[PDB]
Design an enzyme around this catalytic site. Structure first.
Site, short mmCIF file in Angstrom:
data_model
loop_
_atom_site.label_atom_id
_atom_site.label_comp_id
_atom_site.label_asym_id
_atom_site.label_seq_id
_atom_site.Cartn_x
_atom_site.Cartn_y
_atom_site.Cartn_z
N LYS B 64 65.03 -22.29 -108.87
CA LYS B 64 64.70 -23.25 -107.80
C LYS B 64 65.25 -22.75 -106.47
CE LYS B 64 63.29 -26.76 -110.54
NZ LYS B 64 63.44 -26.15 -111.92
N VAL B 65 64.95 -21.48 -106.14
CA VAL B 65 65.55 -20.85 -104.97
C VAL B 65 65.24 -21.70 -103.73
CG1 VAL B 65 65.85 -18.75 -103.66
CG2 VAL B 65 65.38 -18.60 -106.15
N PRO B 69 66.37 -17.57 -95.57
CA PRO B 69 65.80 -16.28 -95.94
C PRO B 69 66.75 -15.21 -96.42
CG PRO B 69 64.59 -17.17 -94.16
CD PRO B 69 65.80 -18.07 -94.31
N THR B 71 69.78 -15.38 -97.70
CA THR B 71 70.42 -15.67 -98.97
C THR B 71 69.39 -15.63 -100.09
OG1 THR B 71 72.17 -16.92 -97.96
CG2 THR B 71 71.67 -17.44 -100.32
N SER B 119 58.31 -32.85 -111.40
CA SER B 119 57.87 -33.80 -112.39
C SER B 119 58.61 -35.13 -112.53
CB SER B 119 57.86 -33.12 -113.76
OG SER B 119 59.19 -32.88 -114.17
N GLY B 173 57.47 -31.01 -118.00
CA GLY B 173 57.41 -32.46 -118.14
C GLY B 173 56.80 -32.96 -119.44
N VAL B 174 56.44 -32.05 -120.33
CA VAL B 174 55.83 -32.42 -121.61
C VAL B 174 56.96 -32.66 -122.61
CG1 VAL B 174 54.51 -31.54 -123.53
CG2 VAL B 174 53.65 -31.22 -121.25
N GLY B 178 57.48 -37.13 -121.12
CA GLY B 178 56.23 -37.82 -121.43
C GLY B 178 54.90 -37.31 -120.92
N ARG B 195 63.47 -29.72 -124.13
CA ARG B 195 64.16 -30.57 -125.11
C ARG B 195 63.40 -30.89 -126.37
NH1 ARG B 195 65.64 -34.90 -120.63
NH2 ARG B 195 63.97 -33.65 -119.63
#
Ligand SMILES: O=c1cnn([C@@H]2O[C@H](COP(=O)(O)O)[C@@H](O)[C@H]2O)c(=O)[nH]1
Ligand SMILES: O=c1cnn([C@@H]2O[C@H](COP(=O)(O)O)[C@@H](O)[C@H]2O)c(=O)[nH]1
Lengths: 211, 239
Positions: B64-65, B69, B71, B119, B173-174, B178, B195
């Site tokens: 999730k950069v 710029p 860094t 999500s 998100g699956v 849900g 999960r």
């Protein structure tokens, strides 16, 4: 009032430079450039060598469940505080606050960034992100030294009791003096760690702050 | 990009032994694993090189950069040096921050995935309203890989409309959150599952069941055939 952004990427240089400026700073901000290169154990090493507080600048920006895991791992590694993005929303910030409260650590909410691209999406959401922080009970914030007017507006929203730190000084062109009219402390990285004499660079900044 | 079975494992366990065991239990069903900060901060970046030595799987680093710029460039360089094939980057910090990641990926022969809309519920506060603009920014910058939400298939169809069918789109998100694989795979090329697989009493069985559900959708494996299928799904969605 001066926090070192230690973004060197190898252990030997990072430890040497930090040691050279230790008299001038008591808090070191460690981010992913150093952590991804040397491991999270570098946080404990810094605390042992320098006795400083450590802010983990991890720009946390995931879903709540993942944010909780990142915060737990970061505080277990010994960080005193972590920097979290507010754009992913309130649930994601709350997940970090919950872990910080459980462990007695601090969450710094990043409301607006210092680089040019911040104007595209972040700036327009900044005041709302700061008000969300206030509503969530956030007491520590990060704002841009490159936009003193935005920094004053942020200070208005968060109040005088909250703690505000500000990056963008030196390399990015923010001014220590004007920045400290609103922020409690400034963050400086390259202007100190790229210098051939980092101690002299840090002393120079401290001079400006005293004055 | 084409991922085996259209299923990417999100390996967010936080200790090496369990992570390696569970990935080994499901490796026969996938060729792509997403490794993020829960595992990397607990075991070190060396865990990516270990997975690359142990399994013949592509590794997507879900970092999730989201920095300035300069860094971002350092983060990407360290991540690719460690062995990641691709990295996930946020677009909310702006074009210069995304460009810095693309420049390193180009230099090192790796890939960038642009996260457009998240999500979780909180995504509705700020990210959703910026998502279409972030996707258009990706198109303008030449981004070819994207992440969008399985929890909002209507938003995912709009994203697909913007990026076109020649871009790769993956969706988390699956399971736990849900999201529906069926509606999701009308628009995305692959789903990410964490999960529902790694917390299962039998991860191999959980993965195999998800793959049976994906096969029941009758999605062509042939790229041109699924491109035509996806075009019709989008046309129906916008009609
Ligand atoms: O809005 C922000 C948030 N964080 N940082 C971070 O603060 C440090 C500033 O370093 P510099 O003095 O070298 O520019 C770097 O670690 C950078 O990722 C910024 O620069 N701007
Ligand atoms: O919008 C997004 C972006 N990334 N992820 C990530 O994808 C995975 C989904 O895992 P799950 O199947 O356990 O929910 C986790 O690693 C999570 O950080 C999301 O869930 N949503």
């Amino acid at each position: 009032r001066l926090i070192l952004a230690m973004d060197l990427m190898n252990r030997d240089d990072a430890l040497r430079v930090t040691g050279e400026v230790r008299e001038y700073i008591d808090t070191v901000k460690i981010g992913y450039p150093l952590v991804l290169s040397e491991g999270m154990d570098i946080i404990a090493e810094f605390r042992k060598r320098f006795g400083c507080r450590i802010i983990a600048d991890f720009k946390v920006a995931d879903i709540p469940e993942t944010n909780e895991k990142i915060c737990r791992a970061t505080f277990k590694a010994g960080a005193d505080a972590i920097i979290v993005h507010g754009f992913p929303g309130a649930d994601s910030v709350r997940a970090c606050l919950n872990v910080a409260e459980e462990m007695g650590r601090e969450v710094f909410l990043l409301t607006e960034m210092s680089h040019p691209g911040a104007e595209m999406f972040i700036q327009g959401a900044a005041d709302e992100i700061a008000r969300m922080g206030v509503d969530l009970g956030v007491k520590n914030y990060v704002g841009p030294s490159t936009r003193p007017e935005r920094l004053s507006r942020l200070r208005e929203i968060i109040g005088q009791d909250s703690f505000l730190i500000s990056p963008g000084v030196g390399a990015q062109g923010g001014d220590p003096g004007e920045t400290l009219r609103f922020a409690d402390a400034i963050i400086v990285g390259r202007s100190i760690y790229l210098a051939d004499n980092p101690a002299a660079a840090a002393a120079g900044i401290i001079e400006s702050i005293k004055d």
